[PDB]
Design a protein around this nucleic acid. Structure first.
Ligand SMILES: [Mg+2]
Lengths: 138, 152, 6, 275, 195, 81, 150, 139, 179, 195
RNA sequence: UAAAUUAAUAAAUAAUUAUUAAACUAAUUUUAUAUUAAUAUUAUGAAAAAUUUAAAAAUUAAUUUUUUUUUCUAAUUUUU
């Protein structure tokens, strides 16, 4: 005689609180764009004397050797350290005010890593540009 | 209720055994290791002060002993003590006469013990069948093999 | 029976 | 509780047998069952059940299977544990040449995750080639061999060194041959024919994952719904309800609410004199 | 090829639209079992993938009841026969499967003492059949909407396969929007039972 | 008869009270059910005093309040430091 | 502060504190095997196992038996008052390897011949001591004799 | 047999069971580690995601505030370079190997003063219990 | 099989009629009536005997409007640690002191905090420039926290001064042995 | 004189809040994070919470503090059982230090996997998301512009419906309601596999 | 504990148990492990489950059980 002791958020609960909707919104941010100004605002977040790297690149370790972008001290996270939740101890506190970015080799991984973020309670990230952040050297 | 939900982090409380117990100089950085290795290594009770001697309140390991007969070493050292033939006790390996029923499949039972499980000790004391094939079924391994070299 | 002393 | 004189003399109130070592495996011996003699993860292998006494005599190290894996690892029938790289060389200066020869494939049978796409430069297959050729060339030495190849020869990419193994060697023969030990080359050829292979097996694995084959990281099939392109509940595809559609209004059985002013159908009771 | 070693399943381009699990639909390529497929190439519902059929094939409409409807398999249809297969593979996998349990049940009412959660069906879907779904779609019956499943023996519960309207998928599955996943709760002692 | 140690209860069989209940399985015996438990069960709690505090004197599982609400009589004399 | 923190990133493991909440004698011979490999037999026993991978399966198989608790290592270096700079691979490099019940050798005999020789290398430690006194006195009695004739 | 029903009281204490296991396996799917930074606080709040029904906030009369007193507090070893600034001061007194005595100011070693087998005369008492039988730690 | 007769042979003196006269029936009786006591006593006497003590303190907590249901849990709240066998001595022989425990739990007084695990004295984070004559900042930290606590326990003769005794010189009591 | 230590270092956290301020009572709700049953700490969760073990005289200030002392002050002696406690205390530290001297090693050689959960476990639980990287989990990405949402809540209705009585108080609704399956009388638990 | 080869149907064999004795082969935690040899051995049938034969109306297969309380004390499972 459950749901009398436990709530309705029992038995009628799709304990899959992971990704019924976020994955979609991940493919939404994939669609719009990211460009210079979308990095230039992040440049101001690098211009902010408080240095916490904004964008992160989820790319294989041989890839980054080929096009090194590590210049502004941005964070290089293996895409599982994001998915698995091992990266939350280094992730902004303001889940609703922060928007980092996610660079990736091919834009499928980026959105596939940014959906992991939005599963971790993060709200804004437009989630890709492998080539812009190099054209925005900063 | 008996399904307690608590941080099991609570059940090994380190309030009394922090690393300043086993490593007594760690806030001193020299990091010395002075542990208590085992319950076995316990040397014994020792008077912290000589003025309060530990009492003699005997145990079942003191108050119940026997007079020291002379071992073959104490008579090898000082032959001035082998003073009667009751001191020429047998070889140390000879423990004494048989004192128990070595029932098969059940250890060595005491005399007066339980014969619930000696169903085949009462049957291996009669002795092996004499003049009878050892192998009751299965065509004795001797009969299976062929006679060779008519004398052997 | 091998002990553990836990 | 009910502890009584000794380790393993705990609860002593349930009637189980203490002192019984429950951790130890059952001596299944003669009994025939898939659960025989198998570490519990190997229970699914019902095609090689390990029942029988001889499996009891040989998993357990019994009578004459007393050293059972009569040929375990640590014997090689072929090369008897001596490295097959000739040190007896004509000139002592060139003894270091043969170091780094491939004794087998080294790259395909292991199955490493070479995440290098086949269009990278050659200098990015050095971290793989090394792990099999240390004790032959320092890591920073390879990056002197795996760059002179890129500079001197017409080969640049992992895909090239897999499509031009003939054109590469002929360069090495007529241009290298004094510095680059051909050990590197046949190592360089063994990875470039793997990185190219795996990328074909990855690029295919990604190209089925769209066509709907959907296998997990460990490659077991997992069936999962496709993404929605249209309305979730079907409308022009709906199966008829399946229960006789005598509506709630043709036989006002229950669940029907009507204003009291608008009471219908009393043509003989109270609609004959409507208001 | 040998009479001993025969392909356990073979490739097949369906011309008709068969309902069964081994079935397919108009124009998709599927590796269905050999014995079944061999009574399709005689039946005409299927034809082995010659290079010609790999572009178009004359499928079947129940309207005029003959092989007139040309279904050309360009790259776009091959994005349609994938989502339409990937869909009705989840269907025919949970509908064919009969997912088992082992549970503890003391007392008399043959009542599972720790009744089942919609978590604990998606868990035995992904465990046994690898069918990964949202446990928000599993609607229970009326007897077990209150207390969970709760009772031994054969229980079933409905899984809602939502996205089937742009696949044009009806009459080739028993119910476009549901499927009956069929539990069974084989009670077991503490030796083999969990929870 | 197969008289082997480990084939049943080692020497015969005895029915101690920890067995007649809690048999093999915990149910536990078919005969020798068990003695009825004739201990003295504690009595249920008295009613608490009416609220007239508006401090949420009603709340039972709260951090502030000890369970017992016993403001009985010359308790004000039991003034504690 | 709306920024992914920037700095040299150290990673910290986890340390599981495991207890036993269900009796072991109700379960299988494999589940009892896992509990044995977690140093857990009796109800209420408690051990502190690491979060390394092959422990994660052992704990997983017996989840219905134990009650786990996870500690990040920094949340362990404070549960016992430990300076942040001292790691644990130098704290352990101080305790002797012969802690109570030193080894777990393949059977209680091999145990009882691992404790035997341990009680021998004590005898030899005093005997290698008692002759090292003689070998030095003997090498001097030689030099006293040798230099006697000069 | 199983005649009368499980006293419906008891199955409730068994619904707490599956909701214990449902809380173990939440622990046994955590990442094996946590990417952390040196400069930042140790565990400024930084728990796992265990803020479902958060308790004991009171910072005293809370079980954890012997620990998170120091975690949330500013981390002293604030950089990998600061670590060697701190790790280069600790010695190992008993470890096997050679040493350099005059590294201190004027200390004269102990083990080479009372020999190796002799231990200082520790005052044995209830509260103070020193290691007993020291000649068993030589393996 | 040894029936310990000479341990029972003189104890039939307190059995009843037929048992005292004959021996093989006298022993059989006592070696059973003894064999059931030491089985009743190990597994059954407590969970009866410790229910009189619970029925006592309860109905003695019941006099003060609280139950055992509330007192047993409102004690462990206050970390008070009085075994029930003791609360039964207080329920009877010290009624006021018991109701004091009663009126304590019902009070909204903050229970004592759980003990703090060991802390890291912050001198471990400084590197003493090793001079022979100056102590390490973490020792004279520990010492002062061990001497202030030795002056804490018991009225003694040790530098007997009112309230807090003398410390800053107690830490330097080695120079008093110096020349 | 009596003594009260409660820890190896003494220095108890101040028991009294402030000269008059609020007293900061401790959390008295049991840490069972669902929030619906709302349990209470039960005098063993309130003995653990105070730094004993689950029993009165285990690990607690009731076991560390001396049994007695010679009235002049000369302390007790090392009880043969006491030393074996100090070894049991040290055996927990070393159980913790070793079990972190292994972890502080594994992260050094990268040996700790990045995917959380053993291979067998991850096949068992469908909440650890598959660790695909360069593909989408459910096959093809939502190529169609989503603005593509299915809400379980629309069609999946789990309503605890009251099984309504056949209304005898009105004549006609008693006759329609007469669901002609009242011949449930063939429910004998008959032999389901024999005759 | 075992449960297999055989029996004009059980003194014989495996397997078990037992007596005596043994040597530390990659696999992991710094975890955890009763493996053996040599002899002694008058045995054919496994609670509650999970199922499987059989008119069974139980037998049969099955395979995990299969209790020895030093004394004072403490305790989290309640004939609501
Ligand atoms: Mg007692």
């Amino acid at each position: 005689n459950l749901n009398k002791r436990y709530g309705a958020p029992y038995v009628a609960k799709g304990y899959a609180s992971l990704d019924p909707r976020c994955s979609l919104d991940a493919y939404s941010s994939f669609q719009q764009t990211v460009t210079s100004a979308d990095m230039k605002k992040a440049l101001l977040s690098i211009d902010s004397t408080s240095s916490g790297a904004l964008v992160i690149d989820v790319r294989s370790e041989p890839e980054r050797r080929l096009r090194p972008l590590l210049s502004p001290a941005i964070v290089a996270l293996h895409p599982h350290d994001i998915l698995s939740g091992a990266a939350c101890p280094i992730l902004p506190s303001n889940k609703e005010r922060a928007e980092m970015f996610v660079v990736a080799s091919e834009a499928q991984r980026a959105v596939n890593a940014c959906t992991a973020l939005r599963r971790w309670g993060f709200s804004r990230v437009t989630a890709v540009s492998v080539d812009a952040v190099s054209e925005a050297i900063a | 209720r008996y399904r307690l939900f608590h941080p099991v982090h609570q059940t090994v409380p380190f309030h009394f055994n922090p690393v300043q117990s086993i490593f007594p100089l760690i806030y001193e950085n020299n990091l010395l290791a002075k542990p208590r290795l085992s319950w076995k290594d316990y040397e014994g009770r020792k008077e912290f002060d000589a003025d309060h001697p530990l009492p003699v309140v005997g145990t079942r390991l003191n108050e119940r002993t026997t007079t020291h007969k002379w071992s073959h070493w104490d008579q090898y050292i000082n032959p001035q003590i082998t003073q009667s033939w009751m001191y020429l006790t047998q070889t140390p390996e000879y423990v004494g006469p048989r004192s128990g029923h070595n029932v098969i499949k059940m250890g060595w039972m005491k005399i007066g013990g339980s014969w619930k499980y000696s169903r085949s000790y009462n049957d291996a004391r009669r002795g092996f069948a004499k003049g009878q094939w050892q192998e009751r079924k299965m065509t004795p391994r001797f009969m299976l093999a062929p006679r060779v070299s008519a004398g052997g | 029976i091998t002990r553990l002393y836990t | 509780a009910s502890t009584a004189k000794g380790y393993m003399n705990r609860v002593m109130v349930y009637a189980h047998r203490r002192r019984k070592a429950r951790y130890l495996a059952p001596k299944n011996a003669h009994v025939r069952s898939p659960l025989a003699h198998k570490m519990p993860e190997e229970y699914g292998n019902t095609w090689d059940p390990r029942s029988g006494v001889e499996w009891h005599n040989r998993m357990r190290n019994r009578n004459h299977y007393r050293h059972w894996p009569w040929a375990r690892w640590t014997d090689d029938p072929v090369r008897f544990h001596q490295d097959s790289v000739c040190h007896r060389t004509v000139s002592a200066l060139s003894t270091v040449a043969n170091n780094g020869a491939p004794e087998w494939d080294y790259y395909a049978e292991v199955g490493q995750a070479y995440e290098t796409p086949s269009h990278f430069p050659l200098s990015y297959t050095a971290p793989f080639i090394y792990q099999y050729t240390a004790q032959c060339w320092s890591r920073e030495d390879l990056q002197s061999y795996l760059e002179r190849i890129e500079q001197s020869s017409g080969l640049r990419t992992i895909a090239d060194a897999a499509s031009r193994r003939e054109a590469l060697y002929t360069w090495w023969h007529n241009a290298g041959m004094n510095v680059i030990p051909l050990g590197v080359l046949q190592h360089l050829e063994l990875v470039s024919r793997d990185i190219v292979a795996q990328n074909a097996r990855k690029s295919y694995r990604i190209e089925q994952h769209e066509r709907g084959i959907l296998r997990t990281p460990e490659m077991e099939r997992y069936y999962a719904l496709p993404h929605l392109r249209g309305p979730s509940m079907p409308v022009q595809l709906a199966q008829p309800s399946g229960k006789y559609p005598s509506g709630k209004f043709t036989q006002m059985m229950e669940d029907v609410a009507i204003h009291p002013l608008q009471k219908p159908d009393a043509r003989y009771k109270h609609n004959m004199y409507p208001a | 090829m040998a009479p001993e070693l025969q392909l356990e399943y073979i490739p097949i381009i369906f011309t008709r639209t068969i309902l069964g699990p081994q079935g397919g639909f108009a124009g998709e390529e599927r590796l269905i079992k050999r014995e079944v497929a061999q009574k399709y190439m005689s039946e005409g519902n299927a034809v082995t993938p010659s290079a010609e059929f790999h572009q178009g094939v004359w499928c079947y409409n129940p309207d005029s009841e003959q092989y007139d409807r040309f279904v050309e398999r360009n790259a776009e249809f091959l994005d349609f026969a994938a989502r339409k297969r990937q869909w009705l593979d989840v269907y025919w996998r949970v509908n064919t499967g009969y997912l088992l349990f082992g549970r503890q049940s003391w007392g008399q009412g043959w009542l599972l003492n720790c009744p089942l959660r919609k978590k604990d069906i998606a868990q035995k879907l992904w465990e046994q059949y690898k069918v990964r779904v949202d446990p928000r779609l599993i609607e229970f019956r009326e007897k077990d909407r209150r207390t969970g499943i709760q009772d031994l023996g054969h229980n079933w519960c409905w899984l809602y396969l939502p996205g089937a309207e742009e696949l044009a998928i009806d009459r080739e599955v028993y119910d476009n929007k549901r499927v009956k996943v069929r539990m069974h709760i084989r009670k077991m002692s503490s030796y083999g039972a969990l929870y | 008869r197969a008289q082997h140690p480990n084939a049943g209860t080692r020497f015969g069989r005895v029915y101690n009270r920890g067995f007649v209940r809690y048999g093999f399985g915990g149910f536990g015996m078919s005969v020798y059910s068990s003695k009825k438990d004739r201990t003295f069960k504690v009595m249920p709690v008295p009613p608490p005093p009416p609220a007239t505090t508006a401090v949420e004197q009603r709340d039972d599982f709260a951090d502030n309040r000890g369970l017992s609400a016993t403001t009985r009589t010359l308790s004000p004399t039991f003034r504690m430091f | 502060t709306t920024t992914i923190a920037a700095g040299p990133y150290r990673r910290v493991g986890n340390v599981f504190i495991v207890t036993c909440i269900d009796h072991p004698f109700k379960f299988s011979w494999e589940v009892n095997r896992m509990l044995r490999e977690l140093r857990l037999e009796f109800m209420g026993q408690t051990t502190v196992v690491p979060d390394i991978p092959p422990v994660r399966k052992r704990i997983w198989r017996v989840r219905h038996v134990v009650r786990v608790d996870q500690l990040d290592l920094d949340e362990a270096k404070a549960l016992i008052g430990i300076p942040e700079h001292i790691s644990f691979r130098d704290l352990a490099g101080q305790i002797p390897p012969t802690f109570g019940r030193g080894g777990s050798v393949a059977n209680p005999h091999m145990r009882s011949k691992m404790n035997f020789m341990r009680l021998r290398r004590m005898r030899l430690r005093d005997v290698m001591h008692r002759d090292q006194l003689e070998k030095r006195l003997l090498e001097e009695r030689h030099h006293a004799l040798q230099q006697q004739q000069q | 047999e199983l005649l009368h029903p499980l006293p419906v009281w008891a199955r409730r204490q068994q619904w707490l069971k599956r909701d214990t296991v449902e809380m173990n396996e939440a622990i046994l799917r955590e990442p094996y580690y946590r990417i952390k930074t040196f400069a930042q606080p140790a565990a400024f709040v930084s728990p796992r995601v265990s803020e479902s029904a958060a308790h004991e906030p009171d910072t005293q009369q809370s079980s954890r505030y012997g620990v998170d007193r120091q975690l949330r507090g500013p981390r002293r070893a604030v950089s990998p370079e600061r670590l060697q600034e701190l790790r280069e001061q600790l010695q190992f007194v008993g470890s096997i190997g050679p040493k350099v005595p005059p590294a201190a100011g004027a200390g004269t070693a102990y083990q080479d003063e009372y020999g190796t087998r002799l231990r200082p005369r520790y005052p044995q008492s209830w509260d103070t219990v020193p290691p007993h039988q020291p000649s068993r730690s030589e393996i | 099989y040894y029936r310990a007769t000479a341990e029972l042979d003189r104890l039939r003196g307190m059995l009843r009629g037929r048992a005292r006269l004959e021996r093989k029936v006298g022993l059989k009786r006592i070696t059973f009536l003894m064999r059931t006591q030491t089985r009743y006593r190990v597994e059954q006497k407590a969970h009866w005997e410790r229910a009189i003590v619970r029925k006592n303190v309860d109905s003695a907590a019941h006099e003060h409007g609280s139950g055992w249901q509330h007192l047993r849990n409102d004690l462990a709240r206050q970390n008070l640690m009085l075994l029930p066998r003791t609360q039964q001595q207080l329920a009877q022989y010290e009624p006021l002191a018991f109701r004091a425990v009663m009126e304590l739990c019902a009070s909204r007084v903050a229970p004592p905090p759980p003990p703090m695990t060991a802390q890291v004295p912050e001198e471990a984070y400084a590197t003493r420039p090793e001079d022979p004559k100056v102590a390490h900042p973490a020792a004279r930290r520990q010492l002062e926290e061990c001497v202030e606590r030795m002056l804490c326990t018991g009225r003694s003769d040790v530098l007997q001064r009112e309230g807090p005794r003398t410390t800053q010189a107690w830490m330097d009591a080695w120079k008093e042995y110096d020349l | 004189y009596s003594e009260y230590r409660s820890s190896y270092t003494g220095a108890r956290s101040a028991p009294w809040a402030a000269p008059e301020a609020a007293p900061a009572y401790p959390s008295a709700r049991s840490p069972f994070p669902l929030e619906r049953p709302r349990f209470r700490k039960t005098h063993i969760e309130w003995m653990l919470h105070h730094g004993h073990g689950d029993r009165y005289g285990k690990y607690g200030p009731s076991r560390e503090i001396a049994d007695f002392e010679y009235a002049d002050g000369t302390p007790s002696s090392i009880s043969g059982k006491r030393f074996a406690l100090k070894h049991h205390q040290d055996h927990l530290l070393v159980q913790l230090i070793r079990s972190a001297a292994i972890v502080e090693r594994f992260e050094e050689e990268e040996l700790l996997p990045r995917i959380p959960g053993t291979p067998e476990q991850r096949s068992w639980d469908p909440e650890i998301p598959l660790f695909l990287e360069d593909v989408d989990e459910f096959g093809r990405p939502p190529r169609p512009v989503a603005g593509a949402t299915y809400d379980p809540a629309a069609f999946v209705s789990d309503d605890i419906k009251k099984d309504v009585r056949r209304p005898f108080w009105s004549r006609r609704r008693w006759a329609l309601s007469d669901n002609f399956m009242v011949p449930m009388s063939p429910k004998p638990k008959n032999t389901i596999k024999d005759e």
